[PDB]
From Swiss-Prot, chains A, B:
Top EC group: oxidoreductase
Enzyme Commission number, as recorded: 1.14.99.1
Binding note for cofactor: Binds 1 heme b (iron(II)-protoporphyrin IX) group per subunit.
Membrane topology note: Multi-pass membrane protein
Site (Not glycosylated): 73
Impact reported for residue 354 to F: Abolishes cyclooxygenase activity
Classification via Gene3D superfamilies: Haem peroxidase domain superfamily, animal type, Laminin
Record-annotated disulphide pairs: 5-16, 6-128, 10-26, 28-38, 538-544
Cofactor(s) recorded in Swiss-Prot or TrEMBL: heme b
Residues given in the record as heme b binding sites: 357
Name of the protein this chain belongs to: Prostaglandin G/H synthase 1
MF (Gene Ontology): heme binding; metal ion binding; oxidoreductase activity, acting on single donors with incorporation of molecular oxygen, incorporation of two atoms of oxygen; peroxidase activity; prostaglandin-endoperoxide synthase activity; protein homodimerization activity
Length: 553, 553
């Protein structure tokens, strides 16, 4: 007998469990539903269903009515709605976490072993008719072909939301502290054990590495002086493992928290800024705590920089992304009255989803110069050649690509998307339409409805055979965007739950940690509260360039 | 100049922070207090403090007036009070955890590094004039001498509550899954990384070990047949590091989850019982799920066993210990309405407080046989010679020692108590009275008020010089016991918050985990719900012996 759970016979987050030889049952516990498949709603659930407006209608509300939102943001409604957005979206994410690559069920190993990525939906059972369940063709489409025909950039489609390369490199930097898939252990495993905003891309994902990067005086990180500017130290002074092209001299190899950050100037840019911010914070702490040792200075600066990161990510980063007329607000005290777990486990789906390579351009315009991919990648002098000011100015001015829509990944890095789709088959990620339901959306009935056009849809229909078969990452990047937006509804409705849970689930946001003393007092606490991208750069530079998550005007 | 925080200025959980050269500031955030030392009470706090009766008064109501309690236990008031017990107790424990031996302040490293025990009060600063802060003598009293005079048994004092050796051994077994101090790392460090009821004393503290214990058939653990009965395998078959006396060969030594269980038959007794249960559960689980592989069977059996452990501990173990007339109840649903973090970190103070060596008798009686310590300690054949039935009957009939009150540790194991005090001093654990205040009690104003007598108190006053210099462990053990109880006011009021947070803070108690599917359905769920000490033994033995946490009549 075939595995019944492969029909995904249970709705609204019921758990399919195999009983006997050919039977299944569903645990509808606290899903709001009753019956064999969990399809009969309870009186409260039912009432909330008819009164629930569609995610599209709410997206419209958040992106329209300039007059209403000016009023809202200047009142308490701002706090009310922020609380609402925080609790409602985060709660889609389980906590404690549930499944992983090895276990499609709750276990003590899945709870304790942090080297695993987690998952929101279990893998597609191995003992089933099609690789995506029961629907679709015997074999899935070629990963290279799907990229070439649907994801490969022809002409450059800029972001209509005005997103720049200062954002793209921030996104890439930031996300790589909690996305470190391991090569040795394989797919579904991770090296970044903080599982969130620990800043291990600055300090290191292990103690040994951290100790090697630290000056062990004044709580500071090691640094070097090139042309009068403070840069991260050479590998000769901080002998940590760094991935540089073999043959490159060690004196030109810079050492930072994250191994891959030397391969791109944009990465090594932010690495410098944050390092330069860390030591600056030590200078402020030491002035008010002359008696504090090196360890106290270091550990307190880290917490201040963890706070600063989340403040900028929520109020500036997600702001630019969402395009919302709601002024987003970082205030942990909002959740102090609700049931919220201050813990987080990074999920493979969020890893898959955060592959935002369409942000990368055709070239890299720095002042009058234009730089090719072969001049930008691996170049180790560019950062020290131009300086922070000049590179931040150049990245804040150049537009970034539109993520959704399709055909917008520059040929140089298309291979990544190919491997993403490949990896999304070793992990046996459920089909896109199943995730639609998990994150509270209606499944698509056609490829037409998915893309909003006719041409590119009809070809996908022939390849996949069924919309119920469409894969996760292709689904996200081919779906029609919201009008004049950066990506589709699915990226928002699925991304944000993961995103917000990570930010607010950080221990520093808890009632226990969100105190003045935690950050060395009012001075440190205000540094978190008033943090800003512009301030992160311009307080650490000689001059102040144009710095923003969006192109001028 | 003298460190201001040595005086412990900040009352009611306010945090002392050094500013400038000789100044300090208190962070009264969310303590309920205002002002420089956190002594000015807010409107609600004042109301709370005047209306709140003394701990001793509550202990009176809970331990008296049986007629009222018969009524209470058969009504919803049982659930109401239990919730109050759960929420008010656990609240006294920081979550996420605060400090460790390295940091007397909040740091990311303290949060991330699960190798550390946590702590509730910071250490006594090294620059303080006296070892305990500001009060007492330049040198503390000799640790060996303190044990001899005040902790060493003369005549045997049985626990007035009727507590038996079945309890005493359960305690030692149960606790040694989350008390595993690292000799190679030093005090303040731990090997038990599950930090609670993970059953890592049955399955081992690491994966490679767990794997060696497992049959890898039907989710079962390895075992061997002896005399027709089920016993843990030899090291020869399951090669794991076991701490046995030098000269005892691998075939002679048994393999279990905790490395030290071979040293005592009572400890190895429970290793057998819990192993039989695990394999017994797997048999039930396979009948319900024939299509299940080995891994899922093992992982589910682990959760059911964790379930049963928490059920028994709360409803029988804590019951006998507390001696309350309130029928204590295990139901995670009680907490589904309040703010509760399903996370736990073991504290060095919980470690220190659980050294319940007074429980151990002058000698061990097994029917008509009287075994001395030298016959009992490291016996390899006693378990197999007698069997489970016979030794459950034996330990259940023999009285255990009264824990508090003083002079009740057998000379054989008095060296343990010595080392606890010496370790405390390395750990730089705050005075006993400082811990009184932190667990909502008033400090003792004299040694007479502590002990409830004249002689022992006078000698202690001479040794310590002041009551505010009295140490944690000696304090807990020399305090006047509640009338007819096992220990005093402090062991309950300091032990309970750690204990209940450890049980209910287990992720299986979370609304995400607490459902039938987690335990393979209803059969597994009911095993947890109806779990019992008597059943744990008697369902795994040929005959039922006397089984209880108290002696007969
Ligand atoms: C949780 O936390 C615990 C406690 O911190 C931690 O314990 C262990 O880890 C730390 C760090 O590994 C150990 O600390 C010791 O640190 C001293 C450092 O002094 C030296 O510093 C300079 C660097 O030394 C050299 O490093 C390498 C290797 O040789 C090389 O590049 C150079 O040669 C370089 O000079 C140097 O000036 C000089 O050598 C100094 O002596 C080390 O000397 C020592 O060897 C340790 O590494 C602790 O000892 C560890 N144990 C304990 C009980 O504290 C855990 O690791 C952590 N757990 C997790 C999961 O993170
Ligand atoms: C020109 C710049 C970029 C280059 C050269 C690049 C290249 C790569 C490469 C080579 C991989 C690993 C592929 C593999 O072996 O599996 C990768 C993965 C990834 N990319 Fe990029 N990419 C770029 C930009 C971005 C941006 C802007 C983002 C947005 C945040 C992003 C997000 C990710 C993520 C989250 C991973 C997976 C990380 C992990 O699991 O270890 N990338 N990219
Ligand atoms: C005759 C039986 C017992 C023996 C032989 C024994 C022996 C020991 C020894 C040798 C240590 C290590 C301390 C040191 O040497 O520094 C220890 C610690 C300890 N004991 Fe016992 N003990 C016994 C009974 C008990 C009981 C009944 C309890 C009650 C629960 C208990 C609780 C503990 C705890 C919690 C520790 C610290 C564990 C750790 O730090 O890893 N012991 N004991
Ligand atoms: C290992 O622990 C075992 C516990 O069984 C010890 O062996 C047992 O020792 C007792 C005496 O202490 C033996 O009792 C003897 O037989 C009868 C009772 O059956 C009794 O009336 C006699 O007076 C006599 O002492 C008991 O039979 C014996 N069991 C076996 C199988 O030999 C042993 O002494 C312990 N090891 C150490 C180092 O003490
Ligand atoms: C490392 O980053 C460098 C940028 O900071 C870059 O070197 C720069 O390359 C440009 C373009 O080739 C040079 O400009 C040259 O070409 C123009 C004509 O297009 C001439 O008018 C100029 O006089 C000049 O010869 C820059 O001079 C050069 N910058 C510096 C400071 O030397 C590298 O491309 C990056 N590294 C690699 C290996 O590609
Ligand atoms: C978190 O989970 C990881 C995967 O379960 C685990 O990695 C390791 O898991 C096992 C056990 O150590 C190893 O599996 C094999 O065991 C067989 C025994 O027959 C050997 O034939 C084989 O050589 C291998 O050792 C894996 O090697 C190993 N890695 C992977 C990717 O599976 C982690 O240890 C665990 N982390 C913690 C902290 O427990
Ligand atoms: C619960 O779901 C199952 C499986 O999806 C339903 O069982 C049927 O589903 C098909 C479409 O309705 C039928 O054609 C099949 O006879 C049967 N298939 C399987 C695999 O069981 C079932 O009807 C659902 N029940 C309810 C009440 O909605
Ligand atoms: C609370 O803080 C300090 C510390 O307990 C209190 O004691 C200070 O002042 C007292 C004189 O009025 C003396 O007891 C001590 O000399 C002094 N202690 C120190 C360490 O300087 C003080 O009374 C309280 N402060 C306030 C503002 O009420
Ligand atoms: O916030 C809300 O989150 C909900 C999550 O279920 C979505 O359905 C809504 O559209 C979104 O606005
Ligand atoms: C308000 O109407 C809204 O119009 C949007 C189009 O702008 C749609 O996406 C919404 O579903 C629709 O309700
Ligand atoms: C009728 C008896 C009511 C008992 C139920 C209330 C349980 C409160 O338990 C209370 O915990 C507090 C915090 O740890 C302590 O300070 C109190 O002394 C303790 O009794
Ligand atoms: C019933 C409950 C309470 O809060 O009173 C309670 C909870 C825990 C303990 C307890 C105390 C010390 C070690 C282990 C358990 C205890 F003695 C009493």
């Amino acid at each position: 007998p075939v595995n019944p759970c492969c029909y995904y016979p249970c709705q609204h987050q019921g758990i399919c469990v195999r009983f006997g030889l050919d039977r299944y049952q569903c645990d509808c516990t606290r899903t709001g539903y009753s019956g064999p498949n969990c399809t009969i709603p309870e009186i409260w659930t039912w009432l909330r269903t008819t009164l629930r407006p569609s995610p599209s209608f709410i997206h419209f509300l958040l992106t329209h009515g300039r007059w209403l939102w000016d009023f809202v943001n200047a009142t308490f409604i701002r706090d009310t709605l922020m609380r609402l957005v925080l609790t409602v979206q985060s709660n889609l994410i389980p906590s404690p976490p549930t499944y992983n690559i090895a276990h499609d069920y709750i276990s003590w190993e899945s709870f304790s072993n942090v080297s695993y990525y987690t998952r929101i939906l279990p893998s597609v059972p191995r003992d089933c008719p099609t690789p995506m369940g029961t629907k679709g063709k015997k074999q899935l489409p070629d990963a290279e072909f799907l990229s070439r025909r649907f994801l490969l950039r022809r002409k450059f489609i800029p972001d209509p939301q005005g997103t720049n390369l200062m954002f793209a490199f921030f996104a890439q930097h930031f996300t790589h502290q909690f996305f470190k898939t391991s090569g040795k252990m394989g797919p579904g495993f991770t090296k970044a054990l903080g599982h969130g905003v620990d800043l291990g891309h600055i300090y290191g994902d292990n103690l040994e590495r951290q100790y090697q990067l630290r000056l062990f005086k004044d709580g500071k990180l090691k640094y070097q002086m090139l042309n009068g500017e403070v840069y991260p130290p050479s590998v000769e002074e901080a002998p940590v493992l760094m991935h540089y092209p073999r043959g490159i001299p060690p004196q030109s190899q810079m050492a930072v928290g994250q191994e891959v950050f030397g391969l791109l100037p944009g990465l090594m840019l932010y690495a410098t800024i944050w390092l330069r911010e860390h030591n600056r914070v030590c200078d402020l702490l030491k002035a008010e705590h002359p008696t504090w040792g090196d360890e106290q200075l270091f550990q307190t600066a880290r917490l201040i920089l963890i706070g600063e990161t989340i403040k900028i990510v929520i109020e500036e980063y997600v702001q630019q992304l969402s395009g919302y007329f709601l002024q987003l607000k970082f205030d942990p005290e909002l959740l102090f009255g609700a049931q919220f777990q201050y813990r987080n486990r990074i999920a493979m789906e969020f890893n898959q989803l955060y592959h935002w390579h369409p942000l990368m351009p055709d070239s890299f315009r720095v002042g009058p110069q234009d730089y090719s991919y072969e001049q930008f990648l691996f170049n180790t002098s560019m950062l020290v050649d131009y300086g922070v000011e000049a590179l931040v100015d150049a990245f804040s001015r150049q537009p970034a690509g539109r993520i959704g829509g399709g055909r917008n990944i520059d040929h140089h890095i298309l291979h990544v998307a190919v491997d993403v789709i490949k990896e999304s088959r070793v992990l046996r990620l459920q089909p896109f339409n199943e995730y639609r339901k998990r994150f509270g959306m209606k499944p698509y009935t056609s490829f037409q409805e998915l893309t909003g056009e006719k041409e590119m849809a009809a070809e996908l229909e022939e390849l996949y055979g069924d919309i119920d078969a469409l894969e996760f990452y292709p689904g996200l990047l081919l779906e029609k965007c919201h009008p004049n937006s950066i990506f589709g509804e699915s990226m928002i409705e699925m991304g944000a739950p993961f995103s917000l849970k990570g930010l607010l689930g950080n221990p520093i946001c808890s009632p226990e940690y969100w105190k003045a003393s935690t950050f060395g007092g009012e001075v440190g606490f205000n540094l978190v509260k008033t943090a800003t991208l512009k301030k992160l750069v311009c307080l650490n530079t000689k001059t102040c360039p144009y710095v923003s998550f969006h192109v001028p005007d």
